[PDB]
């Protein structure tokens, strides 16, 4: 029995790689020598955001590209102004191990989570200010690795137990549950529309599910080993994904393959975070070197380095409004960069 | 500076005094990790150290010593992959390791275990207390003589008691001999790689003396010690 | 995709020897470790050797040591366990697993239930 269903697999397996070499016509770093490169990008330390003691894990953006949320594993969930840098909130977290948070697009609400396996969601307009727990999802069996908001009442979330889930807030119970992956799943990406969205696991593979639906629509195996980053495209039709093989890849759900690969020789060291740029065309990868890259989302070449970290850049996030990026680092410091004529 | 910005910045000052104190009591704790296999006492250990104090993701488990406050965590409900969640450790006082050194047959899994963690990318800084728990079934093994260790590793045979062996009084030979021969094969382990930036302090454990906290705390101690000494470059 | 696609079996009279063979593709050889695995009838999986990338340094373990060599062919991106003198005990399905990232020293969780970059190993019976 287990032997015809391995080898149905495999012609299955066969079957679809022939499908996607028959549409393999032409590469996109054929096409685009015709376009004019971008060139050295410098950037400069514009703030420096201190007062974390243990080494940042993770960060996220608001909607209005003035608050940002930094999750450290010193037991603080610190909200901080990237204008003036003054401190809005310091949240204490009852879990010291946190690994991910998530800001709310509407600014109410901020999540976080880690090895607890627990999703502690904290209200930030409550009656009297005073910033409290508002519910707190159990169910998982691994370490809560993302979360992202879908909406004031739902949010999606992965754990290490290689499956993901659909929570709820105002029942506190799971609505839907995705399942495919083998590995711990490290981090996930909602597309601008909130109907589908991407997640990276510990297997080399990236799955694209349906968020009202919950099947599993195309899976992408072009890295060789395990996927930490991973950031949509801002249409929502293409992604990039870092992987601790020092080398990125763009994939298209249209294409359902790789685009382009981006690598060098001299970096050997495995990929933390990755953005796409409001218009995409500038890919920021960071790297456990102590620092991190530009690279060009259509020349695949190098086009600036942001290096002034003093460990590994854990976390990377761009503005939506692109004015400034956000790297944190283990040094327990987030640096915000920004070009300048 | 307008109003607003005034109230701003006072907030911003009342959050940074709150963070000092955060800082303050931070930097008089310390953290643990234990670690182990299903086979060994690690709940023995965590239960005799909170008695006496001298799903869930990760447990935690705080007693004193001499009025330093200890925070020793132990998983208890991870997935079997642990080369993710291994690293958030990377900054811990030390590695409490615990290993069954009556099981024989799966002591290769815990060297292997060992020889990971040691050897790990993230761990080059972090001390690996190395508890050699459960000698009472140990000695009574080797006094029974139905199991022998050379059919498990063969290079026992030709392996010496060493000469700064302390044993306890009323311990015969062959029982000092299996437990030193166990404490070499970790240590060579331990000792085949790190260039002194982190140590490994070995200690025989039965999962019932009370002094288990008087070693961590004496091992904390050395540890912390060190590393100030390397600040000065004099180690 | 990686995949890992092993070799060698069947009934071997205990005593003799048997040459396992295992098919690198997907990922650079040359830039990753690996290690043999295996689970015996009744039992987990248990680590058996492991080789460097350039194999330089070697090891095996305590149950095998001197009795299997490992080898790799960094051109052909082939590994090799030459097993002799088979015992009964030896009787398990062998897999062959890669260190999960390059350039690194320590294999984690190779020797894990659920590993992602293993292959779906041979049935090896050393029965008389």
């Known amino acids: 029995e287990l032997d015809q269903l391995r080898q149905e697999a495999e012609q299955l397996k066969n079957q679809i790689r022939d499908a996607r070499k028959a549409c393999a016509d032409a590469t996109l770093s054929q096409i685009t020598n015709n376009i004019d490169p971008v060139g050295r990008i410098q950037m400069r330390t514009r703030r420096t955001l201190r007062g974390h003691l243990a080494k940042i894990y993770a960060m996220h953006w608001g909607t209005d590209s003035r608050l940002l949320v930094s999750a450290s594993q010193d037991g603080k969930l610190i909200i901080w102004d990237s204008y003036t840098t003054n401190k809005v909130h310091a949240i204490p977290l009852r879990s010291s191990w946190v690994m991910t948070c998530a800001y709310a697009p509407s600014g109410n609400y901020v999540a976080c989570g880690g090895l607890d396996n627990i999703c502690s969601i904290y209200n930030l307009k409550t009656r009297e200010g005073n910033v409290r727990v508002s519910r707190e999802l159990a169910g998982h069996t691994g370490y809560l690795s993302c979360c992202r908001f879908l909406d004031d009442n739902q949010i999606v979330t992965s754990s290490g137990d290689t499956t993901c889930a659909l929570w709820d807030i105002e029942t506190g119970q799971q609505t839907t549950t995705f399942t495919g992956h083998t590995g711990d799943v490290m981090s996930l990406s909602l597309a601008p529309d909130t109907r589908l969205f991407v997640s990276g696991a510990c297997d080399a593979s990236a799955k694209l599910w349906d968020v009202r639906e919950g099947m599993c629509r195309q899976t992408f195996t072009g890295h060789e080993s395990d996927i930490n980053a991973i950031c949509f495209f801002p249409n929502g039709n293409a992604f990039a994904t870092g992987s601790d093989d020092a080398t990125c890849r763009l994939f298209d759900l249209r294409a359902d393959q790789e685009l382009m690969t981006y690598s060098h020789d001299n970096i050997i060291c495995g990929i933390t975070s990755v953005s796409f740029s409001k218009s995409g065309r500038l890919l920021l990868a960071g790297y456990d070197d102590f620092n991190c890259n530009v690279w060009d989302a259509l020349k695949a070449d190098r086009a600036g380095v942001l290096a002034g970290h003093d460990n590994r850049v854990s976390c990377l996030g761009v503005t939506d409004d692109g004015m400034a990026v956000a790297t944190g680092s283990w040094d327990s410091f987030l640096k915000i960069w920004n070009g300048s004529s | 500076l307008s109003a607003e910005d005034k109230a701003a910045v006072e907030r911003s000052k009342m959050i940074e005094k709150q963070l000092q104190k955060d800082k303050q009591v931070y930097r008089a704790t310390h953290r643990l990790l234990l670690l182990g296999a299903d086979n060994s006492g690690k709940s023995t250990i965590v239960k005799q150290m909170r008695i006496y104090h001298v799903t869930s993701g990760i447990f935690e488990t705080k007693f004193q010593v001499d009025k330093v406050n200890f925070h020793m965590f132990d998983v208890g409900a991870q997935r079997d992959e642990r080369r993710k969640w291994i690293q958030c450790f990377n900054d811990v006082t030390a590695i409490i390791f615990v290993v069954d050194s009556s099981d024989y047959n799966r002591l290769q899994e815990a060297l292997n275990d060992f020889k990971s963690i040691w050897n790990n990318r993230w761990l080059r800084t972090i001390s690996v207390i190395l508890f050699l728990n459960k000698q009472d079934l140990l000695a009574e093994k080797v006094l029974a003589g139905k199991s022998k260790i050379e059919d498990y590793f063969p290079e026992f045979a030709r392996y010496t008691t060493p000469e700064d062996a302390t044993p306890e009084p009323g311990e015969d030979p062959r029982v000092t001999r299996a437990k030193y021969f166990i404490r070499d094969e970790f240590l060579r382990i331990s000792t085949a790689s790190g260039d002194g930036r982190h140590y490994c302090y070995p200690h025989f454990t039965c999962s019932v003396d009370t002094e288990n906290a008087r070693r961590i705390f004496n091992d904390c101690r050395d540890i912390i010690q060190r590393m100030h000494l390397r600040q000065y470059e004099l180690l | 995709q990686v995949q890992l696609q092993e070799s060698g079996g069947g009934l071997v009279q205990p005593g003799g020897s048997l040459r396992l063979s295992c098919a690198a593709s997907g990922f650079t050889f040359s830039n990753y470790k690996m290690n043999w695995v295996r689970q015996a009838p009744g039992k987990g999986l248990e680590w058996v050797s492991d080789i460097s990338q350039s194999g330089a340094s070697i090891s095996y373990t305590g149950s095998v040591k001197g009795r299997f060599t490992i080898s790799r062919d960094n051109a052909k991106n082939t590994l090799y366990l030459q097993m002799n003198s088979l015992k009964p005990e030896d009787t398990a399905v062998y897999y062959c697993?890669?260190?999960?990232?390059?350039?690194?020293?320590?294999?984690?969780?190779?020797?894990?239930?659920?590993?992602?970059?293993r292959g779906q190993g041979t049935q090896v019976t050393v029965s008389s």
């Open positions: 697993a890669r260190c999960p990232a390059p350039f690194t020293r320590d294999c984690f969780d190779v020797t894990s239930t659920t590993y992602a970059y």
